[PDB]
Amino acid sequence: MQDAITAVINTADVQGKYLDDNSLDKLRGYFETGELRVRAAATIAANAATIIKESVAKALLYSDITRPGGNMYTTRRYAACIRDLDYYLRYATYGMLAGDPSILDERVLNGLKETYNSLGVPIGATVQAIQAMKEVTASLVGTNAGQEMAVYFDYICSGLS
Amino acid sequence: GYGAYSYIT
Amino acid sequence: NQILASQGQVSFIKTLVNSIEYTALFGKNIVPYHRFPTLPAANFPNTQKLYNSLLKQSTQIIVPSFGNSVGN
Amino acid sequence: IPVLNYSLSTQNQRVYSFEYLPNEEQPKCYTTDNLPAAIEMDQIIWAAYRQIFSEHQLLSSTRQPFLESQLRFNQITVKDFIKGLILSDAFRYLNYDVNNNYRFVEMCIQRILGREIYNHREKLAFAVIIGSQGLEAFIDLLINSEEYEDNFGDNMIPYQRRRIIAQRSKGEIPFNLKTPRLGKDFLYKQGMPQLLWAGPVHRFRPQEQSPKAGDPALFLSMVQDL
Amino acid sequence: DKTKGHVNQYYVDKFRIASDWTKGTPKTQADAVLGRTFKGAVLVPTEGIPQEFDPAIAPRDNTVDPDPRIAESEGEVYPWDINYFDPQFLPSAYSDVNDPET
Amino acid sequence: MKTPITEAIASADSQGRFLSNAELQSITGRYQRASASLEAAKQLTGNASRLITGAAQAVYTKFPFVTQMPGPTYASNAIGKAKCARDIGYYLRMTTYCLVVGATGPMDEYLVAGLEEINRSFELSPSWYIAALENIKNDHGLSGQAANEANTYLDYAINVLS
Amino acid sequence: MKTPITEAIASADSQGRFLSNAELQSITGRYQRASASLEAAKQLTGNASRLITGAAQAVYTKFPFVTQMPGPTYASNAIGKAKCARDIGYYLRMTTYCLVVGATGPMDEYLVAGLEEINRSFELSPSWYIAALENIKNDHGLSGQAANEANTYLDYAINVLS
Amino acid sequence: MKTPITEAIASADSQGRFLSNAELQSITGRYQRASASLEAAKQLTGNASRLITGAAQAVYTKFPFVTQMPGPTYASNAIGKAKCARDIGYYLRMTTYCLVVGATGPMDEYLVAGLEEINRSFELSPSWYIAALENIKNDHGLSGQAANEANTYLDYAINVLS
Amino acid sequence: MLDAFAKVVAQADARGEFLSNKQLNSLETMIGEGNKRLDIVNKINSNASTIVTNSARALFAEQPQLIQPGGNAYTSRRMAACLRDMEIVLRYVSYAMTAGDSSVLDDRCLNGLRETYQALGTPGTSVAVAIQKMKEASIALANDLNGVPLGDCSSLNSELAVYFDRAAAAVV
Amino acid sequence: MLDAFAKVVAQADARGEFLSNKQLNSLETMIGEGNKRLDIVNKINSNASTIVTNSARALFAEQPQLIQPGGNAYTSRRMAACLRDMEIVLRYVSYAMTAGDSSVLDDRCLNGLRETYQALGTPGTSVAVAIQKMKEASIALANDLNGVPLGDCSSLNSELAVYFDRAAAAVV
Amino acid sequence: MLDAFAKVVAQADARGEFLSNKQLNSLETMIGEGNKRLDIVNKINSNASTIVTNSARALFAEQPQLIQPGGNAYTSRRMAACLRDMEIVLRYVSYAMTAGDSSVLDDRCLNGLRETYQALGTPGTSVAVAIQKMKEASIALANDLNGVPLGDCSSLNSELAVYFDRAAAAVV
Ligand SMILES: C=CC1=C(C)[C@@H](Cc2[nH]c(/C=C3N=C(/C=C4\NC(=O)[C@H](C)[C@H]4CC)C(C)=C\3CCC(=O)O)c(CCC(=O)O)c2C)NC1=O
Ligand SMILES: C=CC1=C(C)[C@@H](Cc2[nH]c(/C=C3N=C(/C=C4\NC(=O)[C@H](C)[C@H]4CC)C(C)=C\3CCC(=O)O)c(CCC(=O)O)c2C)NC1=O
Ligand SMILES: C=CC1=C(C)[C@@H](Cc2[nH]c(/C=C3N=C(/C=C4\NC(=O)[C@H](C)[C@H]4CC)C(C)=C\3CCC(=O)O)c(CCC(=O)O)c2C)NC1=O
Ligand SMILES: C=CC1=C(C)[C@@H](Cc2[nH]c(/C=C3N=C(/C=C4\NC(=O)[C@H](C)[C@H]4CC)C(C)=C\3CCC(=O)O)c(CCC(=O)O)c2C)NC1=O
Ligand SMILES: C=CC1=C(C)[C@@H](Cc2[nH]c(/C=C3N=C(/C=C4\NC(=O)[C@H](C)[C@H]4CC)C(C)=C\3CCC(=O)O)c(CCC(=O)O)c2C)NC1=O
Ligand SMILES: C=CC1=C(C)[C@@H](Cc2[nH]c(/C=C3N=C(/C=C4\NC(=O)[C@H](C)[C@H]4CC)C(C)=C\3CCC(=O)O)c(CCC(=O)O)c2C)NC1=O
Ligand SMILES: C=CC1=C(C)[C@@H](Cc2[nH]c(/C=C3N=C(/C=C4\NC(=O)[C@H](C)[C@H]4CC)C(C)=C\3CCC(=O)O)c(CCC(=O)O)c2C)NC1=O
Ligand SMILES: C=CC1=C(C)[C@@H](Cc2[nH]c(/C=C3N=C(/C=C4\NC(=O)[C@H](C)[C@H]4CC)C(C)=C\3CCC(=O)O)c(CCC(=O)O)c2C)NC1=O
Ligand SMILES: C=CC1=C(C)[C@@H](Cc2[nH]c(/C=C3N=C(/C=C4\NC(=O)[C@H](C)[C@H]4CC)C(C)=C\3CCC(=O)O)c(CCC(=O)O)c2C)NC1=O
Ligand SMILES: CCC1=C(C)/C(=C/C2=NC(=C\c3[nH]c(/C=C4\NC(=O)[C@H](C)[C@H]4CC)c(C)c3CCC(=O)O)/C(CCC(=O)O)=C2C)NC1=O
Ligand SMILES: CCC1=C(C)/C(=C/C2=NC(=C\c3[nH]c(/C=C4\NC(=O)[C@H](C)[C@H]4CC)c(C)c3CCC(=O)O)/C(CCC(=O)O)=C2C)NC1=O
């Protein structure tokens, strides 16, 4: 993976140059937004369970999916579903706090579309669940940090779709 | 990694 | 998956090493080696897909999952 | 033995707040001085009752009838009405018996003088006196004190003072609403761990969903003609 | 596609009839009645003729705190109102990076 | 008596100011809705006795034990019936006073004040009078704005006795 | 809760003084009449269910339209009968609490306070509950001073709902 | 503390206005009688120990049972005598504070307020302290207007404990 | 407390300018809706006690644990207070319906009501269920074509639903 | 504010059931102890001023810091307040002795008394020393066999000691 | 509420000792300065309204957005409140000038004034600008040699500047 800092050292390194004023402006940008990211990751760390509960309650419950015939009908599949949501929340927090979505490229979105199209997981409903996590999470962390979290949830949704 | 080999660069 | 998600890699390696299988095959004094399993399903072919792959030859997963089995 | 000295705080109670023509937000000024016929007396009796007690309670059981009849015939002033009214057992069972001694002073000031307390240091001195001498001489002080005699006089029912500042409508929380009969501080010492907030009731029917821009319902505005 | 087509619940539905507003209210300005606002009020264009002033009078400043009366009249001061802004989410609540002692 | 003009004057008195344009507009509004109220007062006064006897008989049909029960409070005797159409008569006349005055002053003064002790101490159930007023509200036979007037004050009495 | 011990204590509190001989005599009087009160509480507790069903059936025999009337407030359904024995059960239990306490505290607090707005707002006539309490007073079957206890508190409830 | 300056300030505060010429004249009068007051404070401070021991011995000569009576309240022990000269020391020190302040504020606050419950609850007769203050008034040895100062405040303490 | 007109004027004075022609045209529209507004408030006040009583019966029919022992409304007294709170919230919804702006209702009714229901222990969520019931019943009476001239009333019903959603919003 | 009987009744209403025969037998026992209860309260009120004064003298004899200038009991005023507080706590122990339940004493006396002694600066631990002294003196008078017939009162003395331990518990 | 003399006496009672000769000599010095003190207070009160009005004109001349629309000083009303606030700041500085101690001014004027100007939204820093103006104007009148005999008053002017710096300290 890489954060914003590593990305700056990648560009400056791969040019062979040292750190010029542009790269220092990018690191100043990240170091200004750092505290906000920290407290956002603190809040999400606090209320993960309630994010997944409220987002499943908004997006998936009392529908064809949890009715019989639906993908989430058995208790095994319900638990696997909310497990999957937890991964999306956790790695979206890592992606927020790194400031670079390369983590989502390496450890989440790789082979996931082939996996869900293998098993039979509906992609539509997954995306709507992730967007429900985006609205609930933005409600917890506020406007600015909700924009940051939203970008990474939208990154995963753009990955599966 | 911090040093990565892109064909672009 | 549940082992990996629930705790991490440390539990996962402890369950691979401390399994019945690893103790039966290798015991205490044998380094693990490439083997060609015969009996269940696609084990022979899938290990042939694995060990014919070098390091970093593709990011694409050899065995993502198995097919849709009817029932539960 | 005299009362503790408590430093004064600043609030909306103490400024001229000059208005040549009274706003629309001043209190009704129920007063025995402009002379009430029967109804205009009934309003004073109920407006007293709301202020001393609350929006709730009242009803049938608590209401004190004989102080209404004596008041109508001019036997007691409105001040005395509020006095022997605060002393009534109905009020003692519904407010005094539940409250901690340092909170009750917090109610009484706010209903009798119409101002928030300056600081805790106020509350404590007053709190010591009621326990030492009872609820009686405590109310004797507040009513006989110059603050009360000046602002309300003998003939007028006490109300929140300068609740809203000029144009702004934020106001301050009304006292009935702001400090009800029970309190959290009392519940902590006679309670247990308390599960404070019930989760919002959840139903399969959403009954909450916002209407989108696309929906037909918004365009309900005109009949077939005009 | 936010609308619940893929995961389907019979109960969630468009507001086809005036009856049953009961089940929801609009949350944004775009979701609204034709002459209305997100809250129940008549739309006002909010543009008028500013009182002209003398050239000796100093001109108007754009970045002043909005008058306190204006915020309360829209209603945003109350916590229940949707648009409310929490005081904890202010940029003033942060340690500023430019300060030397921090 | 709580009348529109006098609530305007009492409001300006508690403000201590002259009559400003606000409450003058208030008395204007009373002077326009007064026409419909006066029509309604004319025709309730015109059909008074018919409405009272009809209203009483509505109470007897809705609660038949009232006729059957032997007691002083229940209309078994001729005396009980007399008191019954007496009381219904009270409510109908107070509605006409409120239509004439144009606010709820007369009913709030002459009638509503102190009613709980009467209906309590003489064991009068208010459901009876609710049934009577619903009959009067159904067959007063006004139409249009006058009907909105009479329904307004009748419904006010029902909300008090509710 | 208005109990004699606590009236003594509240009186001496509002006077700010120690407990004098007067209110000690008061608590003595409570401690003597207590015995007959506790016997009456034992036997009302013993015959509770019989008194509730007998009282309810007395209400239905005195007012038969209660069964006949189609409505939510009237005991036509099984639900209304369940609420009926529910309410009569409340009155009997509060009488036993007043017998145990030795004053009218539990009835004045849990029951009496705010009752007219309930019997008003839900259209409950008090005459029904008066008939129930008169049946409970007729067939509770106590004797002697215990009977004077139960008749005292039951008659108190009748005077409130009167 | 009731000081002349602060009575001026509190009076103008309760009137809500600026300091007018009246109370400025008041503070002037304090600033003039201050000189004799400070002389009196200096010489009471100078002869303090002598006044305390002489005053205590005056109390023992006037009331000899104080030494004779076996009790904690009576100065029979050495402890009792130490508390005796302690308390007379308190009165003399509060008089010197009042001389310095220029009004009766320190005695009214630190000493006089709540004194009846002390002299009651510990059974201290005030006549003892009265005798002590009369001895201090006899032999403080001031002269002129300073003597009128000290006799003023000492006599004030005697009128309070009277 | 402001009405719609006070609100328009107060904003225009906070900017300190005259009103435009467009604003006054919009106010002509508000007046033209004003008769219908008075009509809806007449329907709500004219049947208010049956709204409170019916919605209370439905409340206690849905959840039975507000009237049972240990329930907040179990005592006769506390039941009287319960029906009071429903009558009060209906009263301020009537006020804010006439005013056109919810400054009255935000000012007096719902200001620190949440922390009050904390301090009492009353479940605020159940109060939101009660306010939902009065919203449904009173909208159902507001749409009633009875004794009233014909037209369209959808915008005003939507306004009224907005007010009840403020109530149920701030009690929770 | 509750006695023993109000406590049993309030619990039995919170469950919403009538009382058993076992409960009423226990209440017969409480009444049979009731004369001894009145006797103890008569002894406490009959000698209350000497209790407060003597326990105060022992307090100032043990620690002399309070009486000294800058001590909390140094001013004449503050000494009067000190004797006040001792008298009040003894008054509510008299009340809770007659009631049989400590609801009066927990309600009025000891509810936020700790934070009061914080806000004044008075050491609450010294107040606990005072209440220990009133406990020792008043139990020593409660066990006195004087002008009163002979019997057993150990349970009631244990009860009284429980009340004083509530007081010294909650002032610290 | 204390003067200089009450402050010295209250300290001497908190230690619980007599006053020394050094203290009483210092008090003789304070009395000898007392005439000059009354003279300064006479000058301040004798020209107070021109102080408030002129410092207000200088305030609105420096920053015009207190009086600009959207400003705190926009309405006849709010302008009257601003002028009144300055008088009080000036009134309590007159009180604390006579007392010699700032106990009155810390007690009544500047106790929670900051959080009040938070709760209103009035910028307290602008109030500090106003109080700086009253300090400069009133010291400029206090140093005036007009109908008053000659001498030295630098310590008293420094004292007065200390009081205005308390005011501008605590409004921000
Ligand atoms: C209902 C219960 C109840 C209490 C328990 C008291 C508690 C209490 N004590 C004081 C106040 C006081 N309490 C004391 C008592 C003390 N003196 C000392 O030397 C000791 C440390 C301590 C006795 C053991 C003193 C001295 C004051 C006055 C303090 C002061 O003014 O400096 C006050 C402030 C009001 C007042 O001045 O009276 C209060 C609330 N009051 C109540 O209403
Ligand atoms: C100003 C308004 C006003 C009223 C509305 C009445 C209300 C009223 N009615 C009665 C009294 C009465 N009212 C009725 C009426 C009834 N008979 C029945 O069968 C029906 C249930 C009911 C008619 C619908 C009866 C029968 C009595 C006498 C009751 C009795 O003595 O038993 C009384 C007691 C005094 C009396 O005996 O007259 C009063 C105050 N009086 C007033 O002054
Ligand atoms: C603490 C004391 C206490 C009481 C005494 C009751 C009193 C009471 N009863 C009802 C309510 C009711 N009470 C009855 C009872 C009756 N059915 C009939 O046929 C008879 C006339 C009568 C029994 C003798 C009925 C039927 C209802 C429901 C009425 C309705 O919904 O129509 C209600 C409204 C709430 C509810 O629906 O439960 C209340 C407060 N509740 C209390 O909390
Ligand atoms: C601020 C002012 C102030 C006072 C004026 C004193 C007053 C005072 N004196 C005593 C207490 C006492 N005072 C005396 C004094 C007397 N011995 C005698 O022989 C004479 C009659 C008399 C001296 C003239 C004695 C002996 C005691 C102890 C009494 C005892 O314990 O029996 C006490 C009780 C506390 C204690 O034991 O110290 C108090 C409050 N204390 C104050 O804080
Ligand atoms: C003092 C009390 C008082 C009232 C109660 C009203 C009653 C009232 N409503 C209207 C007038 C009106 N009232 C309505 C209302 C309705 N729209 C519908 O869809 C429903 C059937 C109904 C609401 C429930 C409409 C639509 C009009 C205008 C009718 C039209 O012009 O076609 C008018 C004629 C004047 C006008 O146009 O405003 C009057 C007097 N006015 C008053 O002064
Ligand atoms: C100006 C506006 C205004 C309000 C909105 C009310 C709000 C309010 N309600 C109560 C008080 C109360 N409110 C209720 C109401 C409830 N019963 C339940 O079963 C439901 C959860 C809920 C009705 C939906 C009850 C039961 C009480 C009494 C609570 C108690 O004493 O246990 C109190 C405390 C004072 C009192 O006891 O009356 C207040 C301030 N009062 C006001 O002045
Ligand atoms: C109104 C106020 C009031 C009182 C204060 C009491 C006082 C009192 N106590 C007893 C009677 C009694 N009181 C006690 C109590 C005592 N047991 C002991 O070990 C201790 C010394 C003491 C408790 C501290 C005993 C034991 C008896 C019975 C004595 C006997 O019969 O020998 C009696 C005689 C009647 C009886 O036997 O009950 C009376 C009048 N009664 C009242 O009416
Ligand atoms: C009751 C109210 C009251 C007052 C207000 C004063 C006013 C006053 N001041 C002085 C007298 C004086 N006042 C001052 C004061 C001043 N020094 C300067 O540098 C400044 C111009 C000014 C302080 C701001 C001086 C210096 C004197 C002595 C003048 C001299 O002797 O030359 C005198 C003459 C008597 C004396 O010498 O003290 C009087 C009456 N006195 C009162 O009784
Ligand atoms: C006892 C001490 C005491 C005070 C110190 C004041 C403090 C104070 N000022 C205001 C209120 C006010 N104070 C000011 C003053 C200001 N105008 C500006 O341009 C400046 C920033 C500032 C003067 C330097 C204004 C303008 C208001 C009204 C604010 C408003 O309504 O918008 C209020 C609210 C009540 C009111 O409207 O009057 C209070 C408590 N009041 C007191 O009782
Ligand atoms: C065939 C195997 C199987 C089971 C059992 C199953 C249960 C299941 N229970 C659910 C909810 C629930 N289940 C309960 C159950 C209870 N509440 C209590 O207090 C009681 C102890 C208990 C009833 C006895 C409740 C309250 C909810 C909804 C909770 C909420 O949404 O807030 C949901 C959420 C969405 C939905 O129901 O459609 C599922 C999927 N699903 C399955 O596929
Ligand atoms: C972070 C790295 C990572 C991810 C993300 C991951 C996903 C993943 N999801 C799986 C299954 C599943 N996933 C779901 C998910 C859903 N069902 C629903 O209805 C919802 C709409 C939706 C979730 C939002 C369900 C029901 C299954 C179980 C299918 C089955 O085996 O029965 C499986 C098969 C293994 C198993 O759970 O039994 C994997 C491997 N695996 C990984 O290693």
Side-chain angles (χ1 to χ4, degrees), chain D residues 9-12 14-15 17 162 165-168, chain E residues 67-68, chain K residues 59-60 66 72-73 77-79 81-86 88-89 91-92 108-109 113 116-117 120 122-124 126-128 130:
Chain D
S9 173
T10 61
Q11 58 188 24
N12 290 325
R14 21 200 284 174
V15 175
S17 186
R162 206 156 162 69
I165 326 302
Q167 311 88 358
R168 316 172 184 274
Chain E
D67 216 318
Chain K
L59 180 60
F60 298 145
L66 301 192
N72 267 193
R77 190 203 178 268
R78 293 200 292 265
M79 189 69 77
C82 197
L83 293 193
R84 157 255 329 212
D85 264 0
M86 287 169 64
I88 298 191
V89 170
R91 189 165 69 86
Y92 288 109
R108 276 91 68 73
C109 181
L113 182 51
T116 301
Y117 289 159
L120 297 171
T122 295
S126 177
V127 183

Side-chain angles (χ1 to χ4, degrees), chain H residues 72-73 86 90 93-94 109-111 113-115 117-118 121-123, chain J residues 49 53 56-57 60 67-69 74-80 83 87:
Chain H
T73 66
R86 195 270 304 268
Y90 286 174
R93 192 178 68 196
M94 297 298 171
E109 185 188 337
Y110 297 104
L111 182 63
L115 189 57
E117 291 80 8
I118 304 307
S121 296
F122 290 104
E123 286 154 27
Chain J
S49 187
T53 297
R57 291 171 184 171
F60 298 143
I67 293 172
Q68 193 210 204
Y74 166 69
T75 299
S76 153
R77 188 204 180 273
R78 295 201 292 264
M79 188 71 72
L83 297 173
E87 286 177 8

Side-chain angles (χ1 to χ4, degrees), chain H residues 4-79:
Chain H
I5 301 163
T6 53
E7 186 167 27
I9 288 169
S11 65
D13 189 25
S14 64
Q15 293 299 308
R17 70 186 87 226
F18 281 138
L19 291 185
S20 69
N21 210 174
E23 58 269 15
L24 291 177
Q25 293 173 354
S26 179
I27 301 168
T28 301
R30 187 258 183 291
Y31 282 158
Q32 294 178 343
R33 207 181 164 62
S35 293
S37 294
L38 287 178
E39 180 202 336
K42 285 180 70 65
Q43 297 187 4
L44 286 178
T45 298
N47 288 319
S49 188
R50 193 267 308 278
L51 292 175
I52 292 167
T53 58
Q57 193 138 320
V59 179
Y60 297 121
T61 54
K62 182 174 172 25
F63 298 94
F65 70 102
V66 174
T67 60
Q68 295 177 349
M69 189 69 76
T73 66
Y74 297 96
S76 66
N77 298 114
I79 318 159

Side-chain angles (χ1 to χ4, degrees), chain E residues 27 38-39 71-86, chain I residues 7 101-103 105-106 110 114 162 165-167 169-170:
Chain E
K27 290 187 316 213
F38 59 88
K39 299 162 52 88
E72 292 178 358
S73 71
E74 290 176 356
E76 296 175 351
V77 182
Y78 294 99
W80 40 89
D81 273 346
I82 306 165
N83 259 353
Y84 185 70
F85 184 75
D86 293 329
Chain I
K7 183 178 179 180
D101 192 9
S102 66
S103 300
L105 180 138
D106 290 329
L110 304 177
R114 180 180 301 167
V162 162
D165 290 330
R166 295 294 292 284

Side-chain angles (χ1 to χ4, degrees), chain A residues 61-63 66-67 72-75 78, chain D residues 202:
Chain A
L61 296 179
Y62 304 106
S63 71
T66 60
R67 281 198 289 266
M72 267 184 42
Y73 171 56
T74 74
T75 52
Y78 193 97
Chain D
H202 333 249

